[PDB]
Amino acid sequence: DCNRALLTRLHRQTYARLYPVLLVKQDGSTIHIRYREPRRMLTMPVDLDSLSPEERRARFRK
């Protein structure tokens, strides 16, 4: 039933063209979002979920 309210569109007169962009968070999952600038892959990063010690450890590992 997840595809119940998905088969829709933008219901306005003046609007830019949007594309089915595949966006990924820090989980590996993908979501389809209508967005300009039709880049196929968008990845959203993270820099604040960790603490200072964890950030320093990640920087050292990098």
Partner: peptide, 19 residues
């Protein structure tokens, strides 16, 4: 939270980036 187009990927790490 609803479902996703693909299942989560194990051992997945973002390179870097602030907000």
């Amino acid at each position: 939270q609803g479902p996703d187009y693909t299942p989560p990927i194990s051992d997945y790490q973002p390179p870097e980036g602030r907000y």
